[PDB]
Amino acid sequence: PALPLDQLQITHKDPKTGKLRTSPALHPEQKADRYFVLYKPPPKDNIPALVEEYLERATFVANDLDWLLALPHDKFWCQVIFDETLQKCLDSYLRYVPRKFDEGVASAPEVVDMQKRLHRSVFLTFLRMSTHKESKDHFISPSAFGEILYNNFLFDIPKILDLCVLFGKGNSPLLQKMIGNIFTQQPSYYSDLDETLPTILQVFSNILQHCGLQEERGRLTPSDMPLLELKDIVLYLCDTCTTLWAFLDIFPLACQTFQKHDFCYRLASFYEAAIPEMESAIKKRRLEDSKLLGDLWQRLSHSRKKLMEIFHIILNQICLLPILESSCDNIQGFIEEFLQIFSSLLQEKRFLRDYDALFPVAEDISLLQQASSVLDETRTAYILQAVESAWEGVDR
Amino acid sequence: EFMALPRLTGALRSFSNVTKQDNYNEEVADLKIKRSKLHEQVLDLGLTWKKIIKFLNEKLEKSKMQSINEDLKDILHAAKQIVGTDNGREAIESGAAFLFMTFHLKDSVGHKETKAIKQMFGPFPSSSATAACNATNRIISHFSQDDLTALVQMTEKEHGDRVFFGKNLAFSFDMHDLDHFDELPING
């Protein structure tokens, strides 16, 4: 038979001369003594001296990771569990590696090739750790596996978000499997997500509070504020929206955790507060910097699109998808949740107009009307007359 | 500075890990201890020393093997100087294999090769890099070009025959980018 790793025993010599004691497979000194250095991203322009510093550090990391992938199931898991340098190195890479949507220079092919090496190797390492059944002989007990995962800080919530925004465009179906597996084997990440949501939302208010939009004594609106402070604000916002959206694109089961914290309304009202002022400021000050302001405009429009996509992903997951499936005809609560969500943002006319332009409301209301045997126009009319007036305020 | 760029997961880490952000207040203590232990970290490269002399003897006539053995002794001496004698015989032989493979396709000492040797064994006398490169090019001057492609194919094959987790898996380098929208129109 095949014995799972957590409970498998290997014989090893004890401190005492010439004495063998059977002991667990995983153990601190069965780990290898390979040191792991932290990752630092490349310089912003191809300054030769800085490039080679980055290259030195990066080759240490990549060689260590190549060897780590070469390792066997028993010794690889020993290393990942007991070597703190390894996990901190991977956290370093995930935290600091440049994202594609970032402001990017072309650099020497050496840095590009090396960066590709690191990208692939890091993804494969995280795949190995997300899998609890490497194959028939080499596997780990589900309950013990999730304990290991959560609790040698192998998977944070930040690291999961980083993983998605970094590897989700190309390798989605695999990363879906990974994330779903770690959440299945250790469900306390949900709680982690829960506890993290207040900080996430705090991010948004901070952005508002930094533009004086809403205890930060009156800061300057985007029209007045210094240019590269505004640049930082919209860069932060773009990174935040892209990361959240990528996470929910990989793992939509998280959405209810989000909506437990009134997320649909929070991002709708944030949209209403933030988007108009920043739009007008970018437009007005475009000629202060031709190229910078156009980039900021691209990022702002990207952020608005990603915000609305987040909104619709949550709406679908907790109302629309449950109605389409499992039609035993007890969908009133789902319907009522939909109606409540929209009643709470009737007044957010600018967000309503743009959101309706992208995911039309009438098409999702008809889903509820089709599914419910007994849904009168009374229950949705006002919502549509909100949408209508939201458009009618502007000349299109 | 890209360590400066504002990231959501950066804020998330800062909020619950104040502890750990200046926990990594470590620079050349950090990398130095790596240098301290990198001496035995490289087991081998593409082709080991025994594989190299097997190839050389298998492809060349005894006529030229006579001189090629003195060339290989020059390379062994250069590795002895670079690696040092206290790690032992097999260590300097793998260093000699590393030297040969470093210069088997290059006819001079360049920034790439000096930096590679330094990465592998720390600081070293460059005179020995010159000696090893000269001996290697002396040896390769006896290769026919079919022989040279055989050597290249052999290096490529063994690098390809290496097995690691997820090696044959499909992987994409496509990363999430900015969606294309359109420039703020002209104002006025």
Author numbering:
A (entry chain B): 2 to 215, 227 to 408
B (entry chain A): -1 to 186
Question: What do the authors of the reporting publication say about this deposited model?
Answer:
ASCC3 is the largest subunit of ASCC and was characterized as a DNA helicase that unwinds DNA by translocating on one strand in 3’-to-5’ direction. ASCC and alkylated nucleotides co-localize at nuclear foci upon alkylation damage stress, dependent on a coupling of ubiquitin conjugation to ER degradation (CUE) domain in ASCC2, which links DNA alkylation damage repair to upstream ubiquitin signaling via the RING finger protein 113A9. As a member of the Ski2-like family of superfamily (SF) 2 nucleic acid helicases, ASCC3 shows striking resemblance to the pre-mRNA splicing factor Brr2 (sequence identity of 41/33% between human ASCC3 and human/yeast Brr2), an ATP-dependent RNA helicase that is essential for spliceosome activation, catalysis and disassembly.
Guided by the structure, we delineated segments and residues that are critical for the ASCC2–ASCC3 interaction, which include a large number of residues that are altered by somatic cancer mutations. The importance of regions for the interaction scales with the degree of their evolutionary conservation. Moreover, we observed that a large number of ASCC2 and ASCC3 residue substitutions encoded by somatic mutations in cancers map to ASCC2–ASCC3 interface regions and that selected, cancer-related residue substitutions in ASCC3 lead to reduced ASCC2–ASCC3 affinity. Both contain a plug/plug-like domain close to their N-termini (residues 59–142 in human ASCC3, 113–192 in yeast Brr2, 107–180 in human Brr2). ASCC3 auto-inhibition may, therefore, be predominantly mediated via the plug-like domain, which remains accessible in complex with ASCC2, occupying a position on the helicase region where it competes with DNA substrate loading. Based on these observations and previous insights into the role of ASCC components in DNA alkylation damage repair, we suggest that reduced ASCC2–ASCC3 affinity might contribute to malignant transformation.
